[PDB]
Amino acid sequence: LDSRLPAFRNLSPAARLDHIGQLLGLSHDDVSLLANAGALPMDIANGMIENVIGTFELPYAVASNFQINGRDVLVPLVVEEPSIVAAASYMAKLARANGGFTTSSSAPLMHAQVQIVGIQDPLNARLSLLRRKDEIIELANRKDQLLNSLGGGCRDIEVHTFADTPRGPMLVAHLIVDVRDAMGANTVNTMAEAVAPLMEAITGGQVRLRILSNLADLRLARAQVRITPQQLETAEFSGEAVIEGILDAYAFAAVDPYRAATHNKGIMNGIDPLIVATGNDWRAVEAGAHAYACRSGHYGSLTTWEKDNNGHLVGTLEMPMPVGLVGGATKTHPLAQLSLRILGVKTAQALAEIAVAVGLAQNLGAMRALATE
């Protein structure tokens, strides 16, 4: 695949679609899903959420130029705000000259929290749970034998205590679960329910909340980009000056939460539209992103920007990225399925890696604009 698409921004929607269809070898019927309104039929919409009276459209666009680990990728995006798609495509174009985006990710690990109350000895109870961790993990896995056959499953437990809260002592167990190609909520919640009676028997306490954590800090996706001074030169500014300007902008975000919020918002401008396009839960991605940004006790920037030993601008984005190819609405929405086909992703972590690449590209575009104005 070649993702460049010259003159794409100036073609009509119909011509853009026909071009995409030809590039990907989409069927006439697949193309029909975008060529005509109503790809989400009312019986599907009515079964997705409650009190439905119709559907609501946002534009469906494709960003060009993206290249991930040497392979060109076309990126569908659904959003209402101008400039996002153009900035994504243009920054991807610059990235291409220097090898594109380089990405990696952790295993798709999610936390299931099991909150325990009603015991006077939470610190002791924690050791009781750890002593019997194998038994707990085995019980969790008995509950989802298919997942284990697919290469996922409960891998570990960790246990945290809050001995002094205004509501008394609490213990919180985390199941650490490989969820393969799911976002993971229903998967881990089910395991949390399954282990609850055993945890009560072990601790002598009362289980309260059984629920995933959206602070998915064991499910990280990583992206790198490199830009040379030559690429950033303007009529007004030399490329070296622009790079220094960008580093100044980054330092500003790193110290001032008023700037970091806006800086990170820019990243999410790139990410959320891909989440929507793939039928994924954007609230979950947002919560993981912003909570991770303040894990140090200070709300800072999700990206980093530096100058390497060669004087080149180098950027990173590492953040939680819980997304699915299966589960939720990723299967139910015919256009979510088409998006996955366009992307060509075969695992959820592959989708996660594309997400962070697009987030990094958007942040680069935002700061290049702010540093050159």
Query: Among the options 30, 72, 178, 281, which is catalytic?
Result: 281
CA gap 355, 267 in Å, rounded: 10
Residue 93 is a catalytic residue: no
Binding partner of residue 260 among a second copy, ligand 1CO, none, CB under 5 to 8 Å per kind? a second copy
Q: Which of residues 187-226 bind ligand 1CO (CB under 6 A)?
A: 211
The 3-state DSSP class for residue 314 equals strand
Task: Please confirm, yes or no, whether 281 is among the known catalytic residues.
Answer: yes
Q: Shortest gap between Cβ of 262 and ligand 1CO (angstroms)?
A: 4
24-28 contacts at long range (C-beta below 8 A, 24 or more positions apart): 24/74, 24/341, 24/342, 26/341
Catalytic residue selected from 50, 80, 81, 373: 81
Alpha helices in 120-179 (DSSP H): 122-131, 133-142, 145-149
Q: Is 144 a catalytic residue?
A: no
Our CA dihedral for 86, 89, 94, 95, rounded to 10 degrees, sits at 140
| 173 interacts with, out of a second copy, ligand 1CO, none, CB within 5 to 8 A per kind | none
Out of 265, 286, 307, 331, the active site residue is 265
Residue 266 lies near ligand 1CO (rule: CB under 6 A): yes
Question: What is the CB neighbour count within 10 angstroms for residue 341?
Answer: 14
- Report, in Å, the least distance between residue 157 CB and a second copy: 14
Question: Which residue in the block uniquely carries the two structure tokens 């243009």?
Answer: 90
Alpha-carbon span 144 to 184, nearest angstrom: 12
> Cβ(257)–Cβ(298) under 8 Å?
yes
Q: How far is the CB of 208 from ligand 1CO (least distance, A)?
A: 12
Smallest separation (angstroms) from a second copy to the CB of 141: 16
Q: Which stretch binds ligand 1CO (CB under 6 A): 191-199, 230-238, 263-271, 337-345?
A: 263-271
The size of the chain, in residues, is 373
Give the residue among 342, 350, 276, 357 at the shortest CA–CA distance from 62.
342
Q: Is 250 exposed, middle or buried (0-12, 13-18, 19+ CB in 10 A)?
A: buried
53 binds, among ligand 1CO, a second copy, none (CB under 5 to 8 A by kind): a second copy
User: Is 33 among the residues that bind ligand 1CO (CB under 6 A)?
Assistant: no
Nearest residue to the partner ligand 1CO, using Cβ: 266
The owner of tokens 């698409």 is 5
Least spacing, CB of residue 265 vs ligand 1CO, in Å: 6
Distance CA 113, CA 135 (A): 17
Q: Where are the alpha helices (DSSP H) in 204-333?
A: 229-232, 239-255, 257-277, 282-293
Q: Which does 138 bind (CB under 5 to 8 A by kind): a second copy, ligand 1CO, none?
A: none
Tokens 């702010």 sit at which residue?
A: 370
In the stretch 135-164, what mask flags binding to ligand 1CO with x, by CB under 6 A?
A: ------------------------------
Residue selected from 227, 271, 321, 366 as contacting ligand 1CO according to rule CB under 6 A: 366
| Out of 3, 203, 269, 330, the residue judged to bind ligand 1CO by CB under 6 A | 269
Q: Which of 138, 262, 326, 347 binds ligand 1CO (CB under 6 A)?
A: 262
* Chain Cα centroid distance, residue 19: 28
Q: Which is nearer to ligand 1CO, 3 or 213 (CB)?
A: 213
DSSP letter for 326, please: B
Q: How far is the CB of 226 from a second copy (least distance, A)?
A: 20
Catalytic residue positions? 81, 265, 281
> Which residues are at the interface with ligand 1CO (CB under 6 A)?
81, 211, 262-263, 265-266, 269, 366
